[PDB]
Write a protein that binds this ligand. Structure first.
Ligand SMILES: *[C@@H]1O[C@H](CO)[C@@H](O[C@@H]2O[C@H](CO)[C@@H](O[C@@H]3O[C@H](CO[C@H]4O[C@H](CO)[C@@H](O)[C@H](O[C@H]5O[C@H](CO)[C@@H](O)[C@H](O)[C@@H]5O[C@H]5O[C@H](CO)[C@@H](O)[C@H](O)[C@@H]5O)[C@@H]4O)[C@@H](O)[C@H](O[C@H]4O[C@H](CO)[C@@H](O)[C@H](O)[C@@H]4O[C@H]4O[C@H](CO)[C@@H](O)[C@H](O)[C@@H]4O)[C@@H]3O)[C@H](O)[C@H]2NC(C)=O)[C@H](O)[C@H]1NC(C)=O
Ligand SMILES: O=C(CCc1cnn[nH]1)N1C[C@H]2CN(C(=O)c3cc(OCC4CCOCC4)nc(C4CC4)c3)C[C@@H]2C1
Ligand SMILES: [Ca+2]
Ligand SMILES: [Ca+2]
Ligand SMILES: [Cl-]
Ligand SMILES: [K+]
Ligand code: NA
Ligand SMILES: [Zn+2]
Length: 805
């Protein structure tokens, strides 16, 4: 109940919201059916429109007008945004030359440059080039300020998950807004686009920017606008707030546009109808910038122009129906569209079986346009599993397609020509970032980055300490002229042991054998040097990774590779090796096919054993440093050490062997040498973070050898590929992957073919940032380079996406 009989007189767009049943006058009151009786009359004036004309100049203030052109309007803070242009011979902001803003030029009483965040729904990255002709204000922000060619959204590339990631720096699995539609089984409650449930605070986790600011004594404009408040009024309200006295004036403001998303759904991303919405958004930017110029704030405020996600061509005829795969289609609930999420329709139905639903959805039709996954098997780069609101069964839908349960759903709910929500690597889903102002750099292009990084920067711009988030603070320092955040590298927690030869061969009873009994002062010196680290500078190019948790591990040196060997997990945490452009691939000699060799530096008790692998009928083993890339027949024996072995499903060894035998050499050819760091990952609770031993759900049968959920590789070379990876003077280039360690290759529909037709495609799907691997392993890489730490943080956030131009 609202007592709507109060009044908005002098309260129009008031900043502190009043609690029921008192009536509201804030920018959200409409959305709650709670505005005072006179809110439209007082607060949403429209008389005479939004622009001054010659004949209104110096008019007698008529308080009924939407905005004013009278002499007192500047001191009142309510001129039409074009007042000075029409009446005082001023130029529009867009017509002025770009002039560097070296320092904030702010009115007296401004404690800090205000931040204005102008967010545009469905603004596809390539609009910046393709619509450039019709967006002069936006093109001026872009060219004069700091811009990226695109900004990567989070998955799913839906509105609320992305807007809330922008607000919090968190992945959707952490902030809780995991879709535009959700069921939370703990609350037994549903979140929907339409309706009241979405307003309840229990959905919204983390700490969004407006709350961070308020806790730290920075005042925030109310960020949200009821849909029916026109854009012109939103802008005028912002400009009026900026004229408040110092102690009342917010320091951060948000404007949100429903366009171009609204038209893009109806017309497709490049429909001829899309020109007009782009022109209109540009005009709104123009109004804001002119308004700021009138207030003498255009060289004071930092402006961020940012999108939530892009827009792809999607029509009703490109829908897959679960009713064409499943017999029991009525026993499931599907969240449908550009992603699928499946759960049982009834929790009382004990013949619901996810195993058989996944199987019935797997590689069933030659050109199938979605792939099913248990959520824990989704590419780790999506960070889309650790929330009870995300259903165990997920469908990754191909770009340009939808999934629905039954055909009747698509016509008893073609209308639409555009949609979004697909994998956040997809080109059409990318969106925009421009920063303009004293704190941003001048005429600077920066590489693409992820939207999870922006909260930290918005906090930097306001001098706030960010709440704990998923950005990597400092990785976007290169966007900023000042207010950079200068982190220190994390402290190493565990120091390595450096074992020498401590065990005789006969102390080992591992059930391993090797044909290695063949018997030189010239080369005995050499092998000793190699075991003491003489080639370490060749194979460990960026320092040893730091271990950021408490554990017991050994560094092991070899001719061709160096490793950090965990006495707790019985295998390396990491294995580092460099392969030059000139390296040759060799085979595993016949007599060495089953060879595994005790490592006399490492106790029997801290070693794997071959008997466990023999007894475990499901599990085999692979090597981290590949025997195919040994530098010589004698060095090859090192690759068969028990300490270089890791457990592998035969199905996965198909993937791994092709990566090691074919792909590493290919990359070293193309990149002029590569340095490779590979290792296991254990993430049995799918939280994206290194498991402790007590979280491991599977061991090699009859042993304490833990089975990895994933295997990673980090592949580094020189950005200037005229320099070899091991003699690089400047910036680095990296690609990485986190491959799921699966007992079948059901994910790859073409896996009965030769590895050359499917393995590299799989690896590309599981591309990763170094930072993702850091979370998953508790390691910190690139500790010793010649590069600045901020540059290294940017490198660690890099994602190689394999999308075309
Ligand atoms: C991305 O960045 C984020 C933010 O930094 C990272 O997430 C953090 O990770 C931490 C480690 O996982 C985690 O720390 C835990 O916090 C527990 C208290 O949590 C509450 O308080 C905070 C502070 O305000 C709040 O933010 C939390 O918000 C979560 O939960 C509410 C609902 O309750 C949601 O609204 C919100 O969306 C958010 O949910 C997300 O996180 C939770 C986990 O907290 C998930 O379950 C959700 O799915 C969702 O993803 C909370 O309100 C604290 O109690 C924990 O300590 C327990 O666990 C440890 C180790 O397991 C142990 O040492 C302790 O003894 C204790 O265990 C006891 O409880 C266990 C569980 O019942 C029980 O099994 C034991 O036997 C014990 O009794 C722990 O310290 C932190 O909360 C989140 N923060 C956020 C915002 O998500 C994230 O890791 C980053 N991702 C990557 C890939 O890097
Ligand atoms: O009607 C549809 C959806 C229609 C649609 C589009 N595509 N499919 N359906 N609306 C979607 C609603 C979103 N909205 C907002 O006012 C809004 C803005 C915002 O900004 C955060 C800032 C963004 C910039 O960085 C700082 C954080 N954050 C939130 C929610 C997350 C807290 C909401 C009105 C719209 C009505
Ligand atoms: Ca959106
Ligand atoms: Ca984990
Ligand atoms: Cl959704
Ligand atoms: K076996
Ligand atoms: Na297959
Ligand atoms: Zn949309």
């Amino acid at each position: 109940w609202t007592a709507t009989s109060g009044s908005c007189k002098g309260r129009c767009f008031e900043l502190q919201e009043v609690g029921p049943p008192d009536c509201r006058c804030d920018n959200l009151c409409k959305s709650y059916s709670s505005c005072c009786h006179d809110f439209d009359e007082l607060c949403l004036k429209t008389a005479r429109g939004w622009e001054c004309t010659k004949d209104r100049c110096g008019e007698v203030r008529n308080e009924e007008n939407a905005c004013h052109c009278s002499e007192d309007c500047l001191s009142r803070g309510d001129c039409c945004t074009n007042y000075q242009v029409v009446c005082k011979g001023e130029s529009h902001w867009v017509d002025d030359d770009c002039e560097e803003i070296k320092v904030p030029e702010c009115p007296a009483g401004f404690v800090r440059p205000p931040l204005i965040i102008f967010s545009v729904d469905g603004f596809r990255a390539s609009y910046m080039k393709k619509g450039s002709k019709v967006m002069p204000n936006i093109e001026k922000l872009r060219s004069c300020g700091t811009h990226a060619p695109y900004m990567r959204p989070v998955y799913p590339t839906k509105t609320f998950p992305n807007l809330y990631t922008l607000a919090t720096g968190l992945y959707p699995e952490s902030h809780g807004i995991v879709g535009n539609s959700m069921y939370d089984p703990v609350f037994d409650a549903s979140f929907h686009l339409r309706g009241r449930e979405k307003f309840n605070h229990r959905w919204w986790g983390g700490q969004p920017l407006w709350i961070t600011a308020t806790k730290q004594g920075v005042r925030a404009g109310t960020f949200f606008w009821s849909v029916s408040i026109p854009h012109e009024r939103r802008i005028l309200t912002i400009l009026q707030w900026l004229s408040l006295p110092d102690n009342e004036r917010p320091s951060v403001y948000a404007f949100y546009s429903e366009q171009p998303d609204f038209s893009g759904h109806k017309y497709g991303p490049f429909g001829p109808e899309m020109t007009n919405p782009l022109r209109e958004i540009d005009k709104t930017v123009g109004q804001l910038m002119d308004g700021l110029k009138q207030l003498r704030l255009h060289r004071c405020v930092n402006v961020i122009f940012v999108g939530d996600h892009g827009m792809e061509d999607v029509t009703c005829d490109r829908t897959e129906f679960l009713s064409n795969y499943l017999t029991n289609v009525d026993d499931i609930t599907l969240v449908p569209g550009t992603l699928g999420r499946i759960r049982a329709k009834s929790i009382n139905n004990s013949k619901y079986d996810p195993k058989t639903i996944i199987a019935a959805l797997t590689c069933k039709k030659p050109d199938q346009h979605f792939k099913p996954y248990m959520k824990q098997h989704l590419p780790k780069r999506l960070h889309y599993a650790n929330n009870r609101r995300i259903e165990d069964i997920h469908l990754l839908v191909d770009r340009r397609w939808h999934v629905a349960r039954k055909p009747l759903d698509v016509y008893k709910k073609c209308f639409f020509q555009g949609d979004h929500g697909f994998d956040n690597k997809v080109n059409s889903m990318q969106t925009v970032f421009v920063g303009y102002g004293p704190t941003f750099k001048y005429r600077t292009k920066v590489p693409p980055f992820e939207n999870i990084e922006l909260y930290n920067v918005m906090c930097d711009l306001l001098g706030l300490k960010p709440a704990p988030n998923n950005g990597t603070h400092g990785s976007l320092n290169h966007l900023l002229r000042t207010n950079t955040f200068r982190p220190t590298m994390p402290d190493e927690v565990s120091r390595p042991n450096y074992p020498g030869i401590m065990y005789l061969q006969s102390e080992f009873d591992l059930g391993c054998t090797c044909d290695d009994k063949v018997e030189n002062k010239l080369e005995e010196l050499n092998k000793r040097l190699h075991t003491k680290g003489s080639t370490k500078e060749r194979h460990l190019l960026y320092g040893r990774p730091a271990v950021l948790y408490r554990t017991s591990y050994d560094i092991l040196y070899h001719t061709d590779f160096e490793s950090g060997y965990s006495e707790i997990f019985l295998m390396p945490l990491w294995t580092s090796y460099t392969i030059s452009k000139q390296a040759e691939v060799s085979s595993i000699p016949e007599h060495l096919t089953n060879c595994v060799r005790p490592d006399v530096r490492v106790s029997p008790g801290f070693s794997q054993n071959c008997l466990a692998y023999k007894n475990d009928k499901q599990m085999s083993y692979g090597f981290l440093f590949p025997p195919y890339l040994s530098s010589s027949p004698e060095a090859k024996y090192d690759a068969f050490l028990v300490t270089n072995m890791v457990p592998m499903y035969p199905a996965f060894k198909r993937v791994w062997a092709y990566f090691q035998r074919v792909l590493v050499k290919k990359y070293a050819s193309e990149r002029n040498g590569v340095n490779v760091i590979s290792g296991p990952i254990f993430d049995y609770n799918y939280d994206g973070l290194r498991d402790t031993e007590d979280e491991i759900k599977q061991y090699v049968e009859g042993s304490s050898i833990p089975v990895p959920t994933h295997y990673y590789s980090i592949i580094t070379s020189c950005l200037d590929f005229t320099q070899p990876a091991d003699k690089c003077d400047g910036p680095l280039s990296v690609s990485s992957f986190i491959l799921p360690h699966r007992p079948d290759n059901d994910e790859s529909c073409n896996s009965s073919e030769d590895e050359s037709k499917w393995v590299e495609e799989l690896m590309k799907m599981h591309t990763a940032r170094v930072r993702d691997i850091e979370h998953l392993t508790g390691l910190d890489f690139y500790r010793k380079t010649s590069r600045s730490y901020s540059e290294i943080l940017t490198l660690k956030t890099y994602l190689h996406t394999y999308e075309s131009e």
